[PDB]
């Protein structure tokens, strides 16, 4: 299972921001035109409609993935190995052969 990591939004919010390239898994970015974002405390910057917000979203491994995960395998020709119990005369021999 993936953990959608959304970082804290960046607002160079009197001016403009540019989408970059990152190696994080499924790194999605988007630049939004005029925002004027609010928090507990009112207006977060000064210019009215010259405000740009950058949305980032990539994907991680969930913390519980070290236990609940799957492994993808390719398996080639199989080999047979047997344990034999040859009893000849009054002597018993145990042995493994390919």
């Amino acid at each position: 299972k993936f953990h959608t990591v959304i970082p804290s939004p960046q607002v160079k919010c009197c001016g403009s921001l540019e989408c970059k390239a990152s190696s994080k898994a499924d790194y999605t970015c988007r630049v939004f035109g005029g925002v004027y974002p609010f928090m507990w405390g009112g207006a977060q910057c000064f210019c009215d409609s010259e405000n740009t917000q950058l949305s980032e979203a990539y994907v991680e491994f969930a913390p519980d993935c070290t236990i609940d995960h799957a492994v993808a395998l390719k398996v080639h020709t199989a080999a047979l190995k047997v344990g034999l119990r040859i009893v000849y005369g009054n002597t018993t021999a145990h042995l493994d052969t390919f």
Binding site: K1, F2, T4, I6, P9, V11, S23, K24, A25, D26, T28, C29, R30, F32, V35, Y36, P37, F38, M39, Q44, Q53, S55, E56, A57, Y58, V59, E60, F61, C65, T66, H69, A70, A72, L73, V75, A78, V82, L84, I86, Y88, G89, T91
Partner: protein
């Protein structure tokens, strides 16, 4: 996206994770700071719901499927041409018996 293997990595502790989970970033509507997003369901979870029964229960010839290493134990199929070179001392003279 939405199928098994939508997120892949060589190991769990790897820094080269590759993923494709269909993340669409939406234009914020509310005044409060927000990152509205939408995503496809976890392919791992979808496969877990639609995995079917394992090889431990769908195996032929009464095979016991075991892991670490992967093996199919105690399979009843076919014939094995064994060739034994019995030591000479085991045989006894026809006079002794």
């Amino acid at each position: 996206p939405g199928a098994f293997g939508d997120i892949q990595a060589s190991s769990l502790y790897a820094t080269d994770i590759v993923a494709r989970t269909d993340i669409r970033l939406l234009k914020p509507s509310v005044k409060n700071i927000h990152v509205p997003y939408t995503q496809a369901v976890s392919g791992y979870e979808m496969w877990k719901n639609n995995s079917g029964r394992p090889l431990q229960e769908t195996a032929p010839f009464g095979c016991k499927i075991e892991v670490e290493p992967l093996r199919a134990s105690n399979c009843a199929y076919g014939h094995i041409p064994i060739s034994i070179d019995i030591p000479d001392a085991a045989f006894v003279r026809s006079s002794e018996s």
